Each structure stands twice: as C-alpha cells, then as structure tokens.
Enzyme design. Structure first.
Site, PDB file in Angstrom:
ATOM      1  CB  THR A   1      -1.004   0.007   1.185  1.00  0.00           C
ATOM      2  OG1 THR A   1      -2.001   1.014   0.966  1.00  0.00           O
ATOM      3  CG2 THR A   1      -0.295   0.273   2.502  1.00  0.00           C
ATOM      4  CB  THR A   2      -0.025   4.716  -1.110  1.00  0.00           C
ATOM      5  OG1 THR A   2      -0.856   4.045  -2.066  1.00  0.00           O
ATOM      6  CG2 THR A   2       0.779   5.801  -1.819  1.00  0.00           C
ATOM      7  CG  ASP A  17      -2.890   4.526   2.290  1.00  0.00           C
ATOM      8  OD1 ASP A  17      -3.478   5.537   2.733  1.00  0.00           O
ATOM      9  OD2 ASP A  17      -2.651   4.362   1.073  1.00  0.00           O
ATOM     10  N   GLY A 132       4.649   2.136  -3.097  1.00  0.00           N
ATOM     11  CA  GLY A 132       3.496   1.277  -2.841  1.00  0.00           C
ATOM     12  C   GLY A 132       2.506   1.184  -3.986  1.00  0.00           C
TER      13      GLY A 132
END
Length: 193
Positions: A1-2, A17, A132
């Site tokens: 994820t980012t 995140d 990500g």
C-alpha cells in the site's frame, strides 16, 4: 500500500496507509528517523524493530550515533539480505524519512531515501517520494501541490491529500526529533480533504 514522504522548510513528514494484529506501516526507528514499508503491516513493524535495534546497538557500543550516511547504509544492508521476504514473496521495500542533525541548515535538513530491491539507494532531491500501490497517483498529486508546502502543517496537509488521491498514520521529523502525529489531527485533515 501507499507511503508518502515530503520535505518542508523545517524537516520531513512521512504518512502511510493503514487498515490485535499490527496495522501501522510507518514507524519511528530512532530520535531522527522513520521507516515506511510498502507491504504488510507485520512485515513493516518487524523491519522497523530490527533497524531500531541496529541503530541503537551502534550508539550504545560506540558512544555516538551513526551519521545519516551510516543510517542509510545499515538500512541498505537489511534490504540486501532480506531473504525471508524474498522466499515468501512479500513486499518489504522501505522508504526512509530522516533528519540530519549534522546538516548546517536545519530548515533543509529533512531527508528522503529510496531503496531498490538489490539494496541500492538514492537520496531524493525533488523533496517528495511515494512507494506502494498508488505511488504513481500520490507522486503526481504531490508534484502539483508541492508549491503550497511552506511548513509542517501544509506538508502534512499535502501528504494526506496525496494518499487520498492514491485514516492514515503520520510522522513529523524536525530539529526537535521524530514525533507521531496525533490521529485526531490526521482525521481533521482527511475530512477537510
């Protein structure tokens, strides 16, 4: 994820995140560094712990912390020798947010370091970096909004907006040290976004 990280006049902000398991992905590793792993939260926390041990073990044994170049190197060796993540097919590429206390200018002392799979690294000179899932969206958002970054609050505001374009947790690092951003402030900003 980012995970996003951007420089501001004063230091650097890293936001990532999330979603009694580990959920957070950005962690303070020492008084002036924070690591954010694009991948699972349990991989992110264990990587941050091993790196926190590495930095503290050196300081306790030498009587002096590693230089910022030394801190990058120890993170690079960890990426180079991460066979546990390679064998299990898990994403474990870290983004490093740091504050060089030895830099002559405290206002631009914030640092962002990117790491490739092989352990090769580069200090970001653009003032922002995203890794990500939605890194491409987060980087383009930061590019268009970076001119509005004047301080820590605006830097946090742009970082949160970049993640929405891609509640998250965040870490602010300045001259006074690395601090976890209260979740109330991020919640306030995410609602405004």
């Amino acid at each position: 994820t980012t995970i996003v990280a951007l420089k501001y006049p004063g230091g650097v902000v890293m936001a990532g995140d999330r979603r009694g398991r580990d959920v957070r992905k950005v962690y303070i590793t020492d008084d002036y560094t924070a690591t954010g792993i694009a991948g699972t939260a349990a991989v992110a926390v264990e990587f941050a712990r091993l790196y926190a041990v590495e930095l503290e073990h050196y300081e306790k044994l030498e009587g002096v912390p590693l230089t910022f170049a030394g801190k990058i190197n120890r993170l690079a060796i960890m990426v180079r020798g991460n066979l546990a993540a390679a064998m299990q097919g898990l994403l474990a590429l870290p983004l490093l947010a740091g504050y060089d206390i030895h830099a002559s200018d405290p206002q631009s002392a914030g640092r962002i370091v990117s790491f490739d799979a092989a352990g090769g690294w580069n200090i970001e000179e653009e003032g922002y970096q995203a890794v990500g899932s939605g890194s491409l969206f987060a980087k383009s958002s930061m590019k268009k909004l970076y001119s509005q970054v004047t301080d820590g609050d605006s830097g946090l505001r742009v970082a949160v907006e970049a993640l929405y374009d891609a509640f998250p947790t965040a870490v602010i690092i300045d001259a006074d040290g690395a601090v976890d951003v209260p979740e109330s402030r991020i919640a306030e900003l995410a609602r405004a976004i």
